[PDB]
Design a protein around this ligand. Structure first.
Ligand SMILES: Cc1ccccc1[C@@H]1NC(=O)c2cc(NC3COC3)cc(NC(=O)c3csc4ccccc34)c21
Ligand SMILES: Cc1nc(NC(=O)N2CCC[C@H]2C(N)=O)sc1-c1csc(C(C)(C)C)n1
Lengths: 990, 212
């Protein structure tokens, strides 16, 4: 099992400077050697064999080059330390000892296996010992997706490898909004290409002015032409040279690892489109093709070690029946709680297929029922995604409360109906759930066998009952001026109530609906899933359904749509239509919806793992998102088996990921010590402790020269130690600083700053920030020029995360503290940006302020404290720390402060020329989100699975409807919002 | 004009076919399948809603059970006895979550001790294998001063195993101490949570603007 802390030994956070390690020599002897914690295994082995000749049986000991160290780790496994560069402190030992042996078996296999294990945080050999067919099949079978992806990466290998590793960071649509054309100078952008031309950084500029819609090759071509101008050749001799040498070069963003490897327009690359908006100068570096292509690890994925009568369901003429026999364990007062009973029910996702049926009451002391339970459903009428939910329940009659819960799939991954005896280790009830059953939670037995175990039995029939193949089902299955009614439901939100009248209305016109694809979600929640007959018709519909937007397909992957034909349609809509761009931005939701899938092997994971191993930028976040949720016991096995399959095939990025994982562990451990044993000590004492530990060679090596988890394009080079510090908070977050080793850091990122926080759940912030991005994206691509700042935030594990530092930004509180008044906020922004920038920086303030008032309101994150709003020097306003608000629990944050800045004039301003615009911005902004309500509802709907206290049911999400005023006419909703805007007019420390 | 979060509250552990009326932006909800149906009323073969509702009561499904409307300072005493239980519980769940992790830790540290001892026992087999030929050579040569160094070392090796074995065996006992402590925390949780269910339905109260 994973190790529970990041300590250097079991029990101990930090080894002291010198450790006595007990060495087990291969001749038999025990020698007790004093080692430095930082010491390498090379130096330990050398000092061991020196001192080993002072002991008996020394004549037996061969050259130390012939031997390797073996010890037990905190994960309770035998690690063979082949890499003897590793330090003592970094080994993660159980107890301070080492065993000298001669190595055995296949070398590269064993090393790779440890490497896969370290990144995941679980040993590989633990999967090898799992006694489960679905698990062992998943492992053998999933390698097919991996075989595809490796075969896809290596087609036209030089270019296609580079594309994997440095995918173009590009928008979804080439067409750019009209408000962005007007940033350009008569259809054209001024660019600077740079070149290195000698061992020393002898730098040369090339300022070009080129069509925004040029490809990188054409941008290169213009560079070549400019160099060639001094030379005297024909026009058709320029051409010859330019043409051949267009495709020996690659453009790269100065300051980070972002390459222009693909034939997209220059404007479609996010970095350029950002420069156009901000009105900045692009600096790209020119760089030789072979000089990148050589750096590419010539990689190759070789395969690992690991590689009866039936009748259809509809031939069986009976009602479903289950026997509840008895339970092993009940944890109960036996005084206050008298009796206990097993509540049961058959569910299709969250909706139940038939009445619930209970057992008789028994005394807690002897929990044995031994009773056939009768379900009000025919066996054929069972759908594919049907499953049993049950729980043991207590009584005071007067008071019912659930003790342990569990759900079981009624069909195997091989579509076999369950039969015979079966034990089920139950689960503890979640925190604030008082429902008798928990149909939401994972399906299967508890890995922790030290829990209440419920025995039960299912009927045996002549043969092995299987669910029929699709072709058999396809066989069986085979009004005017109410189209105003159909379209009018197909626009209404996914959480809106659809009456039994409107259900019967939709089902009746099902065949028509094929015209209006977007209605499928509404249509499906009208089907009676407890009808073999209705079901089979739908299946024929879904099979011949037109495609739909991904944004809308994503609805069909949440809890409410557990049917595999419904999900398979959805996944197919993504396979075809979802762009890498778009994928990346909804990756949080897509991973989380893997939970709701019934089986390990399925179309969605196969889709995701393909895309993850096809594109490294998706792969990186794919890894983290998954790894972060590994501590969670319900999902660890699946996500583990998945992260295993990825790490196997991902290539050389595993080594990059290990260095990240290692760097985070040190930081976890470092924080843990300050949080626990050094908790009381003053700021001076701690800071003294921190710099001492941060200077050590084990720390410096592990946390220098690795890629940021927030962004793998950003390299983190040498620590600027003098600028690293512990923050003020009682959780002790770490402000870190890095030199940027990129050759031309000066232009873009001289300093990478990251906050490392231990102990606070950052998933809420992570989900909030994602949504602010999409609100900006919707506004921007519709012509509404509102500028948000969804800074970087990543969860790396259980209340451990990183935060991007927005530079040159101060909280409103900061500004207040220095002076004070309304005019001082203005004066600061004027003070900083004067002349022909003052006009542009107020125009930035307005737009940012508007967006974080509309988004703030719709999300219900209004009435925010001043300390939580920041301003960049250039004038961009943004909100921070969305966790700090949703934990603690006026609609808008608009203040007379900011109104002075936007109007930029007389203090006594009710309305102004400038103000009126600002207001019209908000209305257009607000109305833009209202018209995209459905997407945000669905984004939140897919994150119900995820354990978050704020998103546990659809009832929580319904606040969004109230803010958007979806029920009311559009015109009305403007009025509703305008109320809130007006309404939000008007000792600060306490 | 009740909310969608208040229909579900009133259908919870109700028999199927319970019914009630609501205002729309009227809506006749119902309990059947273990669900919440909607059958809206447009405000029509019958000359009333009042006349209409009364027939069905006697897959069109019967209105078995009705919801009724009916069921200051002696509720301000009970909210005080909801603030005690809710603190006491969260404190138990705090202690439950810790103990849960700490048990899981002890269970790893045993597996580890097992694998550690397994290594050290192999060392005894290693040493007895190799020492065998050298012990005999020293017997022949009658060199006790050197057989003492071989035995001394073995005395530390076999001695070190015992120290680890009690370390393991001491933790195995502490596990059973912690496990029991864990069963009693969960016994005291499950015997408070029901109380906090039917002292919540109590929270529903008359609506006045003033607080406390
Ligand atoms: C679920 C939801 C969706 C969309 C809007 C609101 C809600 C919440 N449901 C509510 O009833 C509620 C109420 C407030 N505030 C009180 C109103 O008067 C003060 C705020 C919030 N916001 C969030 O919880 C929220 C914002 S982004 C994020 C990310 C992850 C988890 C939760 C959140 C909601
Ligand atoms: C976006 C963001 N940007 C930040 N930048 C800065 O703090 N500074 C840059 C200039 C100097 C320094 C300052 N103003 O003192 S912190 C942060 C941020 C985002 S979530 C967060 C919590 C840790 C509070 C949760 N914090």
């Amino acid at each position: 099992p994973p190790r529970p802390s990041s300590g250097e030994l079991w029990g101990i956070h930090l080894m002291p400077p010198r450790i006595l390690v007990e060495c087990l020599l291969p001749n038999g002897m025990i020698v007790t050697l004093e080692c430095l914690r930082e010491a390498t295994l090379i130096t330990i082995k050398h000092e061991l064999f020196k001192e080993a000749r002072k002991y008996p049986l020394h004549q037996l000991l061969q050259d130390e080059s012939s031997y390797i160290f073996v010890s037990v780790t905190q994960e309770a496994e035998r690690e063979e330390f082949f890499d003897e560069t590793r330090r003592l402190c970094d080994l993660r030992l159980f107890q301070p000892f080492l065993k000298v042996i001669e190595p055995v078996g296949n070398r590269e296999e064993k090393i790779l296996n440890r490497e896969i294990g370290f990144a995941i945080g679980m040993p590989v050999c633990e999967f090898d010992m799992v006694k489960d067919p679905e698990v062992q099949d998943f492992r053998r079978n999933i390698l097919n997706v991996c075989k595809e992806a490796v075969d896809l990466r290596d087609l036209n290998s030089p270019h296609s490898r580079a594309m994997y590793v440095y995918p173009p960071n590009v928008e979804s649509s080439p067409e750019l909004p009209k408000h962005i054309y007007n940033k350009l100078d008569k259809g054209q952008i001024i660019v600077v290409i740079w070149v290195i031309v000698s061992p020393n950084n002898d730098k040369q500029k090339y300022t070009l002015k080129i069509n925004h819609d040029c490809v990188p090759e054409q941008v290169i071509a213009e560079a070549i032409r400019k160099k060639t101008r001094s030379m005297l050749l024909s026009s058709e001799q320029l051409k010859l040279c330019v043409l051949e040498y267009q495709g020996k070069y690659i453009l790269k963003v100065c300051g980070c690892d972002e390459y222009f490897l693909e034939k997209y327009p220059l404007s479609q690359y996010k970095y350029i489109r950002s420069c156009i908006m901000l009105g900045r100068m692009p600096n790209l570096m020119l760089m030789a093709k072979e000089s990148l292509y050589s750096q590419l690890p010539m990689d190759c994925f070789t395969m690992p070690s690991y590689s009866t009568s039936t009748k259809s369901l509809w031939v069986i003429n009976s009602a479903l029946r289950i026997k509840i026999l008895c339970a092993t364990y009940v944890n109960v007062n036996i005084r206050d709680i008298d009796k206990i009973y097993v509540r049961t029910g058959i569910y299709h996702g969250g909706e139940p297929l038939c009445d619930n049926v209970n057992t008789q009451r028994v005394p807690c002391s002897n929990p044995r029922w031994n009773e056939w339970l009768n379900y009000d459903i025919y066996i054929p009428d069972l759908p594919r995604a049907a499953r049993l939910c049950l729980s043991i329940c207590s009584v005071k009659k007067e008071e019912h409360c659930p003790l342990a819960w569990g759900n079981i799939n009624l069909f195997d991954y091989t579509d076999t109906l369950v039969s015979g005896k079966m034990a089920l280790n139950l689960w503890p009830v979640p925190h604030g759930l008082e429902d008798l059953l928990n149909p939401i939670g994972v399906t299967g037995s508890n890995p922790n066998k030290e829990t209440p175990c419920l025995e039960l039995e299912f009927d045996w029939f002549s043969s092995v009952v299987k669910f029929p193949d699709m072709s058999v089902i396809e066989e069986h299955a085979n009004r005017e001026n109410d189209k105003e009614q159909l379209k009018a439901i197909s626009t209404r939100d996914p959480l809106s109530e659809i009456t039994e009248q409107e259900k019967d209305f939709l089902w009746s016109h099902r065949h028509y609906c094929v015209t209006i694809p977007e209605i499928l979600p509404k249509l499906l929640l009208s089907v009676k899933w407890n009808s073999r007959d209705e079901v089979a018709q739908m299946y024929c519909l879904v099979k011949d359904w037109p495609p739909i937007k991904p944004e809308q397909a994503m609805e069909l992957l949440d809890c409410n749509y557990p049917d595999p034909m419904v999900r398979g349609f959805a996944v197919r809509c993504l396979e075809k239509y979802l762009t890498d761009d778009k994928l990346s931005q909804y990756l949080i939701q897509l991973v989380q919806v893997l939970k709701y899938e019934q089986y390990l092997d399925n179309l969605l994971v196969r889709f995701l793992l393909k895309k993850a191993l096809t594109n490294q930028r998706i792969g990186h976040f794919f890894f983290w998102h998954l790894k972060s949720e590994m501590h969670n016991k319900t999902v660890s096995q699946r996500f583990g088996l998945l992260l295993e399959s990825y790490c196997r095939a991902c290539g050389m990025y595993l080594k990059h990921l290990n260095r990240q994982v290692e760097a985070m562990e040190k930081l976890i451990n470092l924080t843990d010590i300050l949080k626990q044993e050094k908790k009381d000590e003053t700021q001076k004492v701690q800071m003294k402790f921190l710099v001492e530990q941060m200077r050590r060679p084990d720390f410096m090596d592990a946390l220098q020269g690795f890629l940021s988890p927030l962004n793998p394009a950003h390299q983190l080079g040498n620590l600027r130690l003098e600028e690293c510090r512990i923050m003020s908070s009682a959780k002790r977050p770490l402000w870190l600083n890095w030199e940027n080793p990129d050759i031309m850091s000066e232009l873009l990122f001289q300093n990478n700053e990251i906050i490392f926080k231990n102990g606070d759940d950052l998933r809420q912030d992570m989900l909030t920030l994602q949504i602010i991005r999409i609100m900006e994206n919707i506004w921007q691509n519709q012509g509404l020029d509102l500028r948000m700042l969804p800074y970087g935030c990543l969860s790396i594990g259980d209340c451990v995360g990183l935060i991007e530092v927005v530079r040159n930004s101060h909280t409103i509180m900061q500004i207040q503290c220095k002076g004070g008044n309304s005019h001082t906020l203005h004066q600061w922004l004027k003070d900083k940006n004067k002349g022909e920038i003052y006009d542009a920086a107020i125009d930035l303030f307005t737009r940012s302020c508007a967006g974080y008032c509309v988004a703030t309101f719709i999300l219900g994150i209004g009435d925010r404290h001043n300390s939580n709003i920041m301003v960049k020097d250039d004038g961009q306003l943004f909100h921070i720390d969305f966790g700090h608000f949703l934990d603690h629990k006026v609609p808008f944050v608009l203040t007379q402060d900011f109104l002075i800045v936007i109007s930029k004039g007389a203090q006594e301003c009710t309305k102004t020329r400038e103000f009126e615009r600002f207001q019209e911005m908000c209305y257009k902004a607000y109305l833009a989100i209202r018209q995209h309500a459905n997407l945000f509802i669905n984004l939140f709907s897919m994150m119900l699975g995820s354990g978050m206290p704020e998103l546990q049911s659809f009832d929580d999400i319904a606040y969004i409807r109230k803010t958007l005023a979806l029920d009311k006419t559009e015109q009305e909703a403007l009025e509703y919002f305008m109320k809130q805007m007006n309404d939000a007019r008007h000792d600060w420390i306490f | 004009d009740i909310s969608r979060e208040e229909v579900n509250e009133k259908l919870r552990d109700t028999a199927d076919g319970t019914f009630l009326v609501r205002d729309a932006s009227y809506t006749l909800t119902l309990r059947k399948g273990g669900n919440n149906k909607l059958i809206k009323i447009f405000h029509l073969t019958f000359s009333s809603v009042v006349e209409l509702i009364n027939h069905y009561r006697n897959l069109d499904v019967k209105l078995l059970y009705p919801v009724s409307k009916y069921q200051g300072k002696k509720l301000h005493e009970y909210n005080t006895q909801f603030q005690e239980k809710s603190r006491e519980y969260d404190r138990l769940y705090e202690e439950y979550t810790r103990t849960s992790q700490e048990i899981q830790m002890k269970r790893t540290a045993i597996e580890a001790f097992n694998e550690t001892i397994k290594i050290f026992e192999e060392q005894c087999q290693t040493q007895e294998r190799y020492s065998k030929e050298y012990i005999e050579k020293f017997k022949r040569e009658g060199n006790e001063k050197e057989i003492q160094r071989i035995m001394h070392n073995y005395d530390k090796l076999k001695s070190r195993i015992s120290e680890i074995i009690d370390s393991r065996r001491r933790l195995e006992e502490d596990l059973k101490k912690q496990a029991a402590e864990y069963r009693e925390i969960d016994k005291r949780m499950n015997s408070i949570k029901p109380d906090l269910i039917q002292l919540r339905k109590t929270r529903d109260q008359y609506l006045m603007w003033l607080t406390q």
